Amino acid sequence: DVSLTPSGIKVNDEITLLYPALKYAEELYLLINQNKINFIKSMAWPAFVNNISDSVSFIEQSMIDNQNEKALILFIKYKTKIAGVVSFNIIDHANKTAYIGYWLGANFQGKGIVTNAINKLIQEYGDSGVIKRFVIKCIVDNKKSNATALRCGFTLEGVLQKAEILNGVSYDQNIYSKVI
């Protein structure tokens, strides 16, 4: 499979999913900083990114988790730029289940980048038999995240009551799955 390269997974001509490396720390930090105000509306971590060392710490932990298959953290490269992150935030090996996460900088939204990334990951991990069940959990009111889940052919399984906390407030989640 020529799309599986040493630097990452080649989705298409424009998109590569990069394996984390410390060299990406600065660009990733600047991307987060540029998107901090908008990101806080949907995710819990951005309020806690204040300096480049927070980016370094994230990369260090991601590399540890990738090494030990606790997670699969990938940096989305669109053309020449890091666009965001797509991940298996949790890999449950015993149950062959992966829980998916994603985010994109504002300047990279509306381009099908995450949908293309997710389709590629499900091909590579699903059709190979490594993962049988893929899961997306997202807050009910998150319009774009719900749209992405459906765009990727996931099926709504239920509503998880008060399951995700942002700023001390618990919100309901939709849980979606794609089963191989």
Ligand SMILES: CC(=O)SCCNC(=O)CCNC(=O)[C@H](O)C(C)(C)COP(=O)(O)OP(=O)(O)OC[C@H]1O[C@@H](n2cnc3c(N)ncnc32)[C@H](O)[C@@H]1OP(=O)(O)O
């Ligand atoms: C599971 C979780 O992680 S929940 C948390 C999700 N993250 C966040 O909420 C963080 C803040 N938000 C974001 O980062 C983004 O809004 C995301 C990642 C949720 C969605 O970004 P999108 O760019 O909409 O992702 P996606 O890859 O599905 O692209 C679809 C959009 O691109 C357009 N598009 C353009 N080209 C294509 C293409 N080739 N293929 C598919 N769609 C395309 C679609 O029309 C659609 O645009 P629309 O929203 O105007 O209808």
